[PDB]
Design a protein around this ligand. Structure first.
Ligand code: FAD
Ligand code: FAD
Ligand code: UDP
Ligand code: UDP
Ligand code: XYL
Lengths: 365, 364
């Protein structure tokens, strides 16, 4: 009776949205992809700054996956610059590797333990657990309270506004503790940055004539009058349902960007600050991108309880609230929910990509 | 909450973007649309594979004599002062163009003063009764030899027509000088948007009343997007499905290159009237002021096929355009604005003025 219009209206041009727009469009669907922001990319958006330095406006995005499927998929849209991110935490005035490893321990205390001895060292400080439900429990019961306190407690209190004990184990479990001497932030098979940035990658992803891209646009601003047959939604679950069950908490961030007139400011990709400063970490994009430049650009991150949602807050009382919403989302007939914000999952880029690719299969089936 | 738009603007170049900003500031609801995946239309600039700030559709040098236009654009961008300089490759030399005192002195091995090069120009000019073509314009000012060395081959190369087959308004665009002024433009306001056109454009479209749709031909969505008025900045002939035949526009192919050196050319653009397939090379860093270890240049090759860039001004074409101009003047809720829409050889600043004036009309 009324126009059929687009087969899909996708809300959010992040990895979640863009992947599905590419997949759907290649199968011949007509797609409108909208984002409240004036650009594509979601968080992973990158751009050149006032000084001509390629940066990440929303904090550093380092690509990493163990999934051949995901890596070969994204390779359809970008070439790679091999890169393995390394993070140093500022503790006791030293820059020490994080995740904690054999060197972290020897350097901090002045030991000369072997990998074999550090296993035993942990075993002798480890608290015994027992439950193993919280973020405190994962660390403490592997490396004991002193290391927990110097590396995790403060940082976590600062990033989440919550003590490690008030967070699900899944949070701090994301950072392993090692007895070897690996100083890499990630141990995944494929670690590489999109050669020319993420944005270039998104552009190729969204290039299909079957995809129309609409920026500076809340879907609600067009959904009353633009015809569409199905919606893939990728923003926060709560807002889509009017906060009917109340605000699902999402941690946010302020970013302070700065340019310095020197080639290198930091000894590595990111320096973390668990025990000092308003900020949690500083990053220097050139280590990440490989860009040569007479100057250098860095971003300082400030955890904010308010503002654009960036992280779900995994804990039992948020997981309970999310179920209220998951139930509504599932029941919603012509709407598919996918991505970090829309499914309330602490997902990495590769993971969202894999989730979106799984969804596309579901839709096709 | 909203139920549609007041304006559907086809084209996110200067023409449409200016109108979008003015309309929206006056509280109108605006959906701007481009076939391309990016705004800025023709002036769109971006960073290449090497991190050099370039112009994918040919160097765009901003210059205006209009205090009004310049102050308008100033709300959206800061400026890097820059007065573009072109050098023409003639007889194995790099000579200033516009032809000036120094072009003439260095070419012929002369030592004329400014007062003398006027008599020299008068002494070789060919008097034409009435000045009709691009040949007449050049020849009645500097003579048949300079015309040949600097205009004929270049023109034949650029347009695929002799300057004799082109309206006078084409070569008249390039002043002939008795002074030693070596700028391509003598305009009052000469500067580039500090951080590039695209960043300027982004500000321009930033209002909440502006919805931006890319990768989209208007025809794909006009049947189901509610809008009052349409502003169209595409090609006129195409809008009327080519009913009277193709309106001829001239096109361009761009070959971009990056070199491992800080500077490849002695100025921003070198023109080749008499040599090579390309009409010109430009070095972007000259224009943007960017600092960089390497450098990116672009060679422009004239093409008869491709995206429309130039209208071909001449009697048979102005006549074909009147036919289309008629249909557009009839078009009820369509305003035609822009270099393509109105088939005019307009500069960036000139299109900005066209748009501001259209906004004033559209408002009273
Ligand atoms: C600071 C930071 C650093 C990170 N670093 C890494 C890293 O190093 N490695 C890694 O793998 N992952 C990293 N991530 C996570 C990564 O960004 C996510 O996995 C990714 O964002 C998932 O993409 P998405 O599509 O699910 O969500 P998003 O990128 O958040 O996209 C959702 C989009 O939908 C839009 N939207 C929401 N509501 C509406 C609506 N009302 N109307 C229109 N548009 C709407 C939003 O503007 C947003 O752009 C990082 C995240 C942050 C915040
Ligand atoms: C190579 C070159 C160099 C130039 N150098 C200078 C210079 O140095 N100084 C100067 O002042 N001027 C210069 N100009 C002129 C300048 O580019 C134009 O004056 C200016 O772009 C006019 O803006 P516009 O909006 O009218 O046209 P455009 O910028 O061409 O915008 C038209 C847009 O509408 C879109 N469109 C058309 N049809 C449709 C449709 N069917 N559906 C959706 N979208 C559509 C097109 O994709 C295009 O992006 C140059 C032009 C060229 C080609
Ligand atoms: O130096 C650190 C880094 C990690 N974390 C904890 O580990 C969690 C996961 O951090 P990760 O870097 O894996 O996720 P990200 O914050 O980068 O998105 C953090 O939120 C912190 O609670 C920490 O305590 N100290
Ligand atoms: O070196 C030059 C520069 C310009 N022109 C003629 O002048 C016109 C105006 O060129 P512009 O650079 O102003 O655009 C061109 O199309 C040419 O026909 C020329 O013959 N030689
Ligand atoms: O005003 C003098 C110069 O022309 C400048 O524009 C500099 O080159 C800036 O980079």
């Amino acid at each position: 009776q009324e126009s059929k219009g687009f087969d899909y209206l996708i809300v959010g041009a992040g990895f979640a949205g863009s992947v599905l727009a590419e997949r759907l469009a290649s199968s011949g669907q007509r797609v409108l992809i909208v984002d409240r922001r004036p650009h594509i990319g979601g968080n992973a958006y990158d751009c050149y700054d006032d000084a001509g330095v390629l940066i990440h406006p929303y904090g550093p995005h380092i690509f990493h996956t163990n999934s051949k499927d995901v890596f070969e998929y994204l390779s359809r849209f970008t070439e790679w610059r091999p890169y393995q991110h390394r993070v140093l935490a500022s503790v006791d005035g030293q820059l020490l590797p994080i995740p904690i490893n054999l060197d972290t321990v020897n350097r901090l205390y002045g030991l000369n333990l072997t990998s074999f001895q550090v296993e035993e060292f942990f075993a002798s400080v480890a608290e015994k657990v027992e439950q193993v439900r919280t973020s405190e429990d994962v660390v403490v019961s592997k490396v004991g309270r002193d290391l927990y306190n110097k590396f995790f407690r403060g940082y976590t209190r600062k990033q989440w506004g919550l003590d490690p004990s008030e967070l699900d184990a899944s949070v701090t479990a994301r950072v392993p503790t090692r007895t070897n001497r690996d100083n890499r932030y990630f141990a995944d098979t494929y670690q590489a940055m999109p050669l020319h940035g993420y944005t270039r990658m998104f552009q190729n992803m969204l290039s299909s004539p079957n995809i129309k891209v609409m920026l500076n646009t809340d879907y609600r601003e067009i959904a009353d009058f633009i015809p569409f047959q199905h919606m893939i939604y990728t923003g926060p679950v709560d807002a889509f349902f009017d906060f009917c069950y109340g605000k699902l908490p999402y941690r946010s961030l302020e970013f302070r960007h700065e340019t310095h007139d020197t080639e290198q400011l930091l000894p590595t990709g990111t320096v973390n600050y668990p025990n000092d400063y308003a900020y949690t970490r500083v990053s220097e994009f050139k280590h990440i991108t490989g860009q040569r430049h007479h100057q250098t650009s860095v971003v300082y991150e400030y955890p904010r309880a308010e503002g654009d949602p960036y992280y779900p807050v995994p804990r039992p009382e948020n997981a309970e609230l999310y179920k209220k919403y998951e139930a509504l989302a599932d029941a919603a007939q012509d709407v598919t929910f996918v991505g970090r914000l829309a499914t309330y999952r602490y997902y990495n880029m590769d993971q969202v990509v894999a989730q979106a690719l799984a969804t596309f299969r579901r839709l096709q089936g």
